[PDB]
Amino acid sequence: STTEEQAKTFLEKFNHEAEDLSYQSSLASWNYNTNITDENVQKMNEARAKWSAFYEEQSRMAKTYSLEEIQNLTLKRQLKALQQSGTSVLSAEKSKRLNTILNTMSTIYSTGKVLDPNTQECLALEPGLDDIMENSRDYNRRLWAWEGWRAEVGKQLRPLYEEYVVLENEMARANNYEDYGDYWRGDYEVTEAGDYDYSRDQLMKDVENTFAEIKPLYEQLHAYVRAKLMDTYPSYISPTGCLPAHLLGDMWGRFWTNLYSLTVPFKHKPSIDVTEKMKNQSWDAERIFKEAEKFFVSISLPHMTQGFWDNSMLTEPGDGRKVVCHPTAWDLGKGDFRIKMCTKVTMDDFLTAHHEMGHIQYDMAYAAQPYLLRDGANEGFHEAVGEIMSLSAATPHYLKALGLLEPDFYEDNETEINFLLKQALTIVGTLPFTYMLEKWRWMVFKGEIPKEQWMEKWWEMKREIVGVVEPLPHDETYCDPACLFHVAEDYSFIRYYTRTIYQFQFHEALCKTANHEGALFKCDISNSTEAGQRLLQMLSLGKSEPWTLALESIVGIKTMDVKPLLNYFEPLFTWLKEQNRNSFVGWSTEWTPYS
Amino acid sequence: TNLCPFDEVFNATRFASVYAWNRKRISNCVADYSVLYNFAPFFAFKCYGVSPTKLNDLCFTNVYADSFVIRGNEVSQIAPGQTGNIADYNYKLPDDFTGCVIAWNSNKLDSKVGGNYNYRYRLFRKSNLKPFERDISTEIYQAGNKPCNGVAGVNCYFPLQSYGFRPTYGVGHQPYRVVVLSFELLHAPATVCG
Ligand SMILES: *[C@@H]1O[C@H](CO)[C@@H](O)[C@H](O)[C@H]1NC(C)=O
Ligand SMILES: *[C@@H]1O[C@H](CO)[C@@H](O)[C@H](O)[C@H]1NC(C)=O
Ligand SMILES: *[C@@H]1O[C@H](CO)[C@@H](O)[C@H](O)[C@H]1NC(C)=O
Ligand SMILES: *[C@@H]1O[C@H](CO)[C@@H](O)[C@H](O)[C@H]1NC(C)=O
Ligand SMILES: *[C@@H]1O[C@H](CO)[C@@H](O)[C@H](O)[C@H]1NC(C)=O
Ligand SMILES: [Zn+2]
């Protein structure tokens, strides 16, 4: 009879059986990542085979209801997530090869080799080819390096992408959707909650407007790098033109990080870095992970359970065991929290521990909530909470109190300007790249871009938005959107644009609450209780509330604001006015090495 | 002249579940409650209506002992006036309870690599419980309007769920042993006291 009774009882059975099997899967992965043996990796298969198989029926056995006969808001959201079937609602025979094409694409990307002239010996991307990608300043070798990768792998994947788009586009029409691009846009959609409505169509509105106010910063940043890059390559960069696409410190040009040596303003005043001073007082791995608490304990955030200190790996194994050394924060569930990292004694490792510790605190705050609503508010919230912590752990005031810096240390403005440019090359020079990649990918999925104009349309927006040109044009043989990790394994990329605008909104309120005066780039939130208790409001809601409500409580604006990202770089913006007055602003798209 | 009978209720190789708990009647004995502070008065010793000190010399007609194993966060429901899965369907206490509730940690005994699947509790029941009563029932729950014919399936769930207990859990899902002592006073000679 009543839908409320059976719907409420079904989730009680699901919310408890899920915990038993979810914990089994997570621990099986932890054992494999610490013990790589043939027998141990075998045990993983069953752990993931009794969760993927288990989730299928509960998706079918929760679709036999109807949404409009539920009046509770909290209870209704748990059903909506569980009703998503994917391709399982379609026939098994027309969607059997859709899996086969997808995993085939990733196999080719993994197996890729770029040789060298005379074929003296072979090279591979990890780590050999990446090592010499932009470590040298040989233009002719740079040209070989770029087109070599584009020719080898970009040619093979072109047939295997049109079939990928066409076959899977109809899958979106099976789940009641317009285009596949809107399916990826459904993580920022909330309905039936007054004054807190967000639509898929709206996510194109704010992103276009939020980038409209970032261009003035990017406009002047391009001029500075172009002016100083002329010294290394004086024959191939005109005073007024777009940057070449193979002088950027990456195979794809995502992060402008490997350019500090060629673009350092002051070469007489070193940037602050303490690795030897830490290497003086017989510093060990445990001490690094203990001072991480004092940042969190002295801000009123909780301690960590004793299970953190015995079951977790906080150092290299030191034995014949083979493990993966990439840092990761794990949430095995049911009160078990662990951290895995190959810790060494360096300044860069000091800040990484602060980042990884921020993830654990977010998990420790919403464990009370149901299983299906135990995650961040949206895609880019987990990597925004854990990035502001490294911002208060690299300030030259916090380190002074920690005793790792001399009490008498003057803060010259040259170091401040030198420090700000390093951050701009990482978190400011990648925003147009992500927007351009996603805007093309949304349009190519919609169907507005025709068959013959795929790759021409790729470079039409490249000149206008980011401002790079290809040395040698290609017609229909090279797929540039095939050389990336995310694009070739069916992942999203808009999580990397929101988390960069979201962190600076969080940082501008946790500092104003803490009563800090001055510029924001020397802000320490340590010893503040009012600020440290405001963060415990968003962090405990999880996915119970819409992402609009979570942001409303912390900053005071229900939308995305870009002004905080322009107050973190305000001293930098003043400097570029004087150092770019005797130069040209903007870039011309018509200029190209065609002949 | 005789040792206290606090040797099987408080010291057992294996305990019982909560859906089918254990009751022991203790009477006609010289029992000293000072030993209760020597084994495990660790997590909680709360009681109401009887002072935990200077009232051990009073005489009562009967003493009741109940023992079971529940979760760490579920010990807050063993009290008059609380609600929850344990309090409303497994074990309910009267509004004017007379006795002390003792809880302590037992991780080293009720934890296994695969988990102790021998501990079970009842998840949903048709109606709430009356105080001081127990139910050991294996009958399907009719969540719908269709007869189940005694076989589970759609809208037909097994009413008892397990307690997976592993040593790597937190201090919230760790196994705990709770012994509830009930003091009764009635119209009869109070033989049991010390
Ligand atoms: C890891 O594997 C080795 C042998 O491969 C074994 O001796 C050791 O006990 C294992 N350690 C753990 C924690 O499983
Ligand atoms: C919605 O569910 C919650 C569950 O905690 C309950 O307390 C509340 O009364 C429900 N709302 C309505 C209108 O029934
Ligand atoms: C630490 O620095 C002091 C500075 O004088 C030095 O004397 C001492 O030897 C250093 N300790 C080391 C290098 O272990
Ligand atoms: C940095 O040094 C002092 C700071 O008080 C100031 O006079 C000077 O103009 C600043 N800028 C430069 C480029 O020296
Ligand atoms: C301020 O921080 C320092 C270093 O963490 C600490 O020793 C001191 O007690 C703090 N003061 C207050 C008032 O919290
Ligand atoms: Zn879901």
Taking the C-alpha atoms of residue B18 and residue B67, their distance in angstroms, rounded to an integer, is 8
A97, amino acid identity: R
Short-list A504, A128, A527, A125, CA closest to A296: A527
The span from the CA of A489 to the CA of A482, in Å, is 10
Residue A548 has which token pair?
């609009």
A 10 A CB-CB count for B76 gives 13
B149 is a domain residue = no
Q: The dihedral of CA A542, A545, A547, A552: what is its sign? A: negative
Q: In angstroms, rounded to a whole number, what is the distance separating the alpha carbons of residues A133 and A141?
A: 10
φ, ψ of residue A113 to 5 degrees: the values are: -125, 135
Long-range Cβ contact pairs of B33-39 (< 8 A, separation 24 or more): B33/B194, B35/B4, B35/B6, B36/B6, B36/B102, B39/B10, B39/B11
Answer yes or no: are the C-beta atoms of A570 and A577 closer than 8 Å. no
Report the candidate in A365, A373, A381 with the shortest Cα–Cα distance to residue A544: A373
Q: In whole angstroms, give the CA distance from residue A350 to residue A278.
A: 10
Among A321, A322, A338, say which to mutate for ligand 1: greatest number of ligand atoms within 8 Å of CB. A321
* Rounded Cα distance, A371 and A25, in Å: 15
Specify the amino acid at residue A176: N
- On the question of a cis peptide bond just before residue A127, with omega within 30 degrees of 0, the verdict is yes
Q: Are B186 and B143 in contact (CB under 8 A)?
A: no
Q: Is the dihedral angle over the CA atoms A215, A219, A221, A225 positive or is it negative?
A: positive
Report yes or no: A502 and A269 within 8 Å, Cβ to Cβ: no
DSSP structure string for B69-95: EEESGGGGGSSTT--SHHHHHT----T
Residue nearest to atom 4 of ligand 5 (CA): A401
Active site residue A359: no
Q: Containing H/E element for B180?
A: strand B175-184
Angstrom distance (rounded) from CA A209 to CA A548? 18
Give first-to-last CA distance, chain A, whole Å. Answer: 76
Helix axis angle, A413-427 relative to A570-579, nearest 10°?
A: 100
Q: Which tokens sit at A202?
A: 């709206």
In this structure, the residues whose C-beta lies within 6 A of any atom of ligand 5 are A 294, 298, 401, 526-527
Q: Which of A69, A486, A489, A570 is catalytic?
A: A486
Pairing type for strands A468-469 and B62-71 reads unpaired
* Positive or negative torsion for Cα A67, A71, A73, A78: negative
Exposed e or buried b per residue across A575-590, where buried means at least 16 C-beta atoms within 10 angstroms of its C-beta: bbeeebeeeeeebeee
Name the H helices within A382-518. 382-385, 398-402, 413-427, 431-446, 454-465, 495-512
Taking any CB pair shorter than 8 Å as contact, residues of chain A touching chain B are 1, 5-6, 9-10, 12-13, 16-17, 20, 23, 27, 61, 305, 307, 311, 332, 334-337
DSSP A314: -
B173 Cβ contact partners less than 8 Å away, ≥ 6 residues apart: A334, A335, B71, B72, B73, B165
Strand-strand pairing, A468-469 and A243-244: parallel
Say if CB A209 and CB A563 are below 8 A apart: no
Instruction: Give the span between the Cα atoms of A497 and A517, in whole angstroms.
Output: 28
- Among A32, A92, A31, A28, which Cα is nearest to A56's? A92
Q: For a pocket test of ligand 2, which of A72, A74, A75, A373 has the largest count of ligand atoms closer than 8 A to its C-beta?
A: A72
Q: B114 — contact with chain A (CB < 8 Å)?
A: no
Q: Which residues contact A200 (CB under 8 A, 6 or more apart)?
A: A182, A185, A186, A188, A189
Q: Which of A75, A68, A91, A69 is nearest to A14 (CA)?
A: A75
Q: How far is CA B109 from the centre of its chain?
A: 17
Q: Does the distance separating the beta carbons of A20 and B170 come in below 8 Å?
A: no
> How many residues are there in chain A?
595
Q: Nearest residue CA, atom 2 of ligand 1?
A: A35
Distance A397 CA to ligand 4 centre (A): 21
Among candidate residues B120, B188, B127, the one with its CA nearest the CA of residue B158: B120
Helix residue ranges, H only, A495-556: 495-512, 530-541, 547-555
Contacts 24+ apart (CB under 8 A), A113-122: A113/A152, A114/A145, A114/A148, A114/A149, A114/A152, A115/A148, A117/A144
The Cα–Cα gap between A437 and A207 comes to 13
* One-letter amino acid of A111: T
Tell me if residue B160 falls in helix, strand or coil: strand
Counts of helices then strands in chain B (DSSP H, E): 2, 9
- Reported as half-sphere exposure (CB side, CA atoms, 13 A), residue A284 has a value of 4
Whether residue A311 and residue B168 make contact (CB cut-off 8 A), yes or no, is yes
Count of domains for chain B: 1
Grouping H, G, I as helix, E, B as strand and the rest as coil, residue A70 is coil
**Angle between the N-to-C axes of helices A454-465 and A431-446, in degrees from 0 to 180, rounded to the nearest 10:** 150
Tell me which chain B residues have a C-beta less than 8 angstroms from the C-beta of A1.
145
Could you say which ligand is closest to the alpha carbon of residue A298? 5
**Are A462 and A283 within 8 A, CB to CB?**
no
In the three-class reduction of DSSP (H, G, I as helix; E, B as strand; rest coil), residue B120 is classed as strand
Question: Hey, what amino acid is at A141?
Answer: R
Among the listed residues A147, A356, A387, A470, the single catalytic one is A356
In chain A, where the domains are located: 1-84, 97-161, 275-359
Task: Using an 8 Å CB-CB cutoff, list chain A residues near B145.
Answer: 1
- Three-class SS state of A573: helix
Strand boundaries in A166-321, DSSP class E: 243-244
What residue type is assigned to position B155 of the chain? Answer: N
* A427/A418 Cα distance (integer angstroms): 15
One-letter amino acid identity for A220?
A: Q
Q: What is the CA radius of gyration of chain B?
A: 19
- Interface probe, candidates B145, B168, B174, chain A, greatest A C-beta count within 10 A: B168
First-last CA distance in chain B = 11
The amino acid occupying position B69 is V
**Beta strands, E only, A475-581:** none
Buried b / exposed e over B150-165, threshold 16 CB at 10 Å, is eeeeebbbebebbbbb
Q: How many CA atoms lie within 13 A of A100 on its CB side?
A: 6
Residue B147 placed within a domain = no
**Cα A507 vs. chain centroid, distance in angstroms?**
18
Structure tokens of A303? 């301690």
* Backbone break loci in chain B, preceding residues, C–N > 2.5 A: none
Q: What is the DSSP secondary structure assignment for residue A480, as one 8-state letter?
A: S
Q: Is residue B77 part of a domain?
A: yes
CA atoms within 13 A on the CB side of A503: 22
C-alpha to C-alpha distances, A527 to A299, A301, A308, A531, B169, nearest whole angstrom:
5, 11, 24, 9, 32
**A396 burial via Cβ count (<10 Å: 0-12, 13-18, 19+):** middle
Residue B15 domain-assigned?
no
Rounded distance between C-alpha atoms, residue A500 and residue A431, angstroms: 8
SS3 state at B190: coil
Task: Say which ligand is closest to the CA of A411.
Answer: 4
8 Å CB contact between A467 and A243: yes
- Token couple for A357: 């510790």
Per the structure, the complete domain to which residue B33 belongs is given by 22-130+161-184
Q: Element (H or E) spanning A328, and its range?
A: strand A328-333
Amino acid, res. A107? T
- Whether A251 contacts A146, CB under 8 Å: yes
- Tokens 């790996």 appear where? A313
Which residue in B145, B162, B169 is closest to A335 by CB distance? Answer: B169
Q: Are strands B99-105 and A336-340 parallel, antiparallel or unpaired?
A: unpaired
Q: How was this structure determined?
A: cryo-EM
Three-class SS state of B127 = coil
Q: How far is B66 from chain A (nearest CA, A)?
A: 27
Number of Cα atoms under 13 Å in the Cβ half of residue B136: 5
Return d(Cα A82, Cα A95) in angstroms, integer: 21
Amino acid occupying residue A501: I
Structure tokens, B137: 């029932």
Angle at A337 between CA A336 and CA A340, to 5 degrees: 130
Nearest partner of A462 among A439, A442, A443, A489, judged by Cα: A439
Chain A contact present for B172, CB below 8 A? yes
Distance CA A480, CA A461 (A): 13
A88 CB-near residues (< 8 Å, 6+ apart): A56, A59, A60
- A502, with CB counted inside 10 A (0-12, 13-18, 19+), is buried
Residue B175 lies inside a defined structural domain of this protein:
yes
CA triple A263-A584-A580, angle to 5 deg = 50
| A23 contact residues in B (CB cutoff 8 A) | 164, 166
| Residue type at position B50 | V
Nearest one of A67, A71, A62 to A10, comparing CA atoms:
A62
In the three-class reduction of DSSP (H, G, I as helix; E, B as strand; rest coil), residue A440 is classed as: helix
Between the CA of A37 and the centroid of ligand 1 the distance, in Å, is 9
Region for B127 from its dihedrals, namely left if φ exceeds 0, alpha if ψ lies in -120 to 50, beta otherwise: beta
- Write a three-state SS string for B128-157: CCCCCCCCCCCCCEECCCCCCCCCCECCEE
| DSSP secondary structure, A105-119, as one string | HHHHHHS-B---GGG
Cα A573 to Cα A220, A321, A566, A568: the distances in Å are: 8, 50, 9, 10
DSSP secondary structure string for all residues of B4-19: -STTTSS--SS---ST
* Placement of tokens 């802000």 in the chain: A523
**Cβ-contact B83, B93 below 8 angstroms:** no
Among A354, A420, A429, which Cα is nearest to A385's?
A: A354
Token pair listed for A397: 């005031």
What radius of gyration, in Å, describes the C-alpha atoms of chain A? 26
Q: Which residue has the tokens 């209780």?
A: A529
Tell me which residue of A212, A206, A214, A170 sits closest to A185, measured CA to CA.
A206
Identify the sign of the CA torsion A181, A549, A430, A105. negative
Label the pairing between strands B175-184 and B99-105: antiparallel
The two three-digit tokens of residue A213, written as one number: 């106010």
* Whole-angstrom distance, CA of residue A535 vs CA of residue A533: 5
Resolution of the structure, angstroms: 2.8
